[model samples]
Target: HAQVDAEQALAQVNARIAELHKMPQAQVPASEAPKVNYGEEIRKLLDTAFELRTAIESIIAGKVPPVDLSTIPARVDLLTTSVKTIQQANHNLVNKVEAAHVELGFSITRALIRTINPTSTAAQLAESKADVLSTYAKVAAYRDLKPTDAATVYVKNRLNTKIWQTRINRDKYLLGKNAEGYKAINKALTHATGVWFNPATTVKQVDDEVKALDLAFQAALDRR
Candidate 1:
């Protein structure tokens, strides 16, 4: 329904613009047709997001293949991939929708139509590690939910604790330049080291350090 609403809203505005395009070559009231031009690409994204969501729901219900418990790694991997893929698709579509809204004045709430948010599910699944999907679900949830794979651990490009020290060193080297964050940067790097060296470091631990560092960087950014 949200998609339908968005579609209709866009269609109405587009229809008016198309009609006006056919109108007389006069300046009765022209505003460049409201500047919100969504097209096949976004619509395709809409469909893709829905399709991904559907696949995720089915896999979760054990309707997909590898319904056997013996297939631990494969089944869990398949489920996790489907869920994560939906998450990625949702992220891009939301960005694209809001992006379009920026061009226009404002728009519908259809962005909520793609409803597979794996972050919440992943967290939940992780805690419910009673089943085969539980452990890996939690792992994939943690693994997929946060921190991009990057060289430097900036506030935006967060530290991928799973990556190697060499990459982390690259991030630390980049951090070294932020003289403003003399104390904070050093602290984050220390925690980053703790996370990297420790065999049992949790994503939560790394994320906690990352959060603190992100706040520190943001605070420093505003300093005169």
Candidate 2:
């Protein structure tokens, strides 16, 4: 009985296709019903659809359309999203590595050279440690540097300007997000300095002391 119904449906589909073929060329949109081996194509499609329906019924005792079985669109979207996520992660990783290079590079470069060519009684390692402390001093003074103009210049000349700029951006982003960037910059700054400025001593022992002064500069534009 089910087979008879399917045959009837197939026959009706064939008759409709035949009627369509007999119609005037202007009646059927050329874009949709372009001329081809129409009779054979229709028959093949109907047969394939019936076979697919039978396969579905064997599994769940129900018919399913071709649309439900196709996953191309969904798969494409998933793949695109995965690629975008990976690209973003790669960009972030590259930026971090660049930042680390600048911080560590300067930390080791100047520290070691000053040690090899000494002008003071400080030990080679001690000088290196002192450099780290000096870096921290610069940072602490960053907020208090008079004129605000000299602050960045001082930082840029002493430390890698590009690195310091990168650090500032990271710190700002971190305070707003997970504080991850801030922690990284702080870690690099502290570890290098702590090598010299041991935790037990106070700032009194530190040399090249300057009074804590800050820049009082502000930008304002009055509308006329």
Candidate 3:
């Protein structure tokens, strides 16, 4: 039902936006529509994906039995956030692009809609957002779910642990660049070395380090 409703509504959106173009005096859709950012949604999902994996890990470790939503925070957030971002981007594109073309913006918009609610249960969103930013986000979620994958997990965990520790040393590298592509990588490298050395790092240390660096960077920007 959720999927159906979203599809129908999105279809209506496309139809209406299409009509706007036929009038010959239409505003570009990108400029008119609200940004359909799914960052928050993906964040929520990443949280879930990470936690879900963690819960399974705990069971394997013979530790406290388990509850739920353990180690999925990051990946779930990554996937869903990416989806939302692309959806928003598509929303903007449809508002801006050709109604008659039907192959470009319209087709892509429908693809985004399918990711959220695909009519075919067998079809996965995994492939839908490949060209879009959501691809990495979903991968992040997948990593959390299967952190044991030699190729993906080892490298990710090693990096994750190091960055986790670096935030504790009050390093300036923990800054939030916000642009989120290479900038995110650059910013992450700042505290990573510190984390690599301290394997026993706590989550608070990671959180605090990140907070401190971000705050310091913000202050520096203000100075300029």
Candidate 4:
């Protein structure tokens, strides 16, 4: 299940790549391709992410004996480093659609952010592991200075952080999976962006939306 998001995101990039080639990949001109091989690095990154997810799952499940748990943080660091490379390469990767869709790359990356960083003493519970990521997605995929990007940045920055996490954590407890979590995040992400961004949205309503987002982050921490 952890790897599913990564694979799906990569698949989107793969589809985008196919469209750009316009012909067979081999036959296409070199200059015609997107600036970087988007899916290639992501596959490798997914490999790193998978191993960490495996370790986290097994260790938490008591499937492995404890000797050195240090490797878990190392793998987290490794995962972070790997995706940061892609994040860098993603800069060269023009074409907002491809760049934007590959935005799900962090969907995989941050799936680990919620994992408790345990060391038998102190644990990383509320660190902003996913903060930079949401920010990364915001600017990289949604900072194209266009109307679409404006709406996108608004939602991606707001919905995918504490807002989305809160919805997901509580929604699972209340509604369970049942296509519910997926639908909730998307509905708020795009739909709410329109509500507050519209001419009909009053200043007071905008104020409440901002205050509500702040409250959600605070509330998620409390539920922990």
Q: Residue 223's C-alpha lDDT in candidate 1?
A: 55
Compute the lDDT of residue 116 as modeled in candidate 1.
25
Best by lDDT: 4
RMSD of 2: 31.5
Arranged by lDDT with the best first, the candidates are 4, 3, 1, 2
- Candidate 2 lDDT, 93-145, residue by residue in tens: 22122233234335434443332232422344454555544543343333233
**RMSD (Å) of each candidate, 1 decimal:** 20.5, 31.5, 21.2, 16.5
For candidate 4, report its TM-score: 0.27
lDDT of 3 by residue, 1-224 (tens): 54323233334334433433332112213321221122223233333334434444555566773432222222222234343453444334311212211233233354334333313232234344443354333332331222222222222232443343333322333344323322444465555546534656544444454455445445444543
lDDT minimum window of 10 residues, candidate 4: 20-29
lDDT of each: 0.34, 0.32, 0.35, 0.42
TM-score comparison, 1 vs 4, better candidate: 4
Question: Model 4: per-residue lDDT, tens digit, 15-88?
Answer: 43343333222222345222223343344444445545555556656677232454355335434544554455
lDDT of 4 at 46: 48
> Which residue pairs collide in model 1, if any?
152-171
Tens digits of per-residue lDDT, candidate 1, 59-97, equal 556576222222222223333333333333323322122
Candidate 1 wrong stretches, greater than 4 Å: 1-158, 161-178
Backbone clashes for every candidate come to: 1, 1, 30, 0
**Residue 99 displacement (Å), model 1:** 32
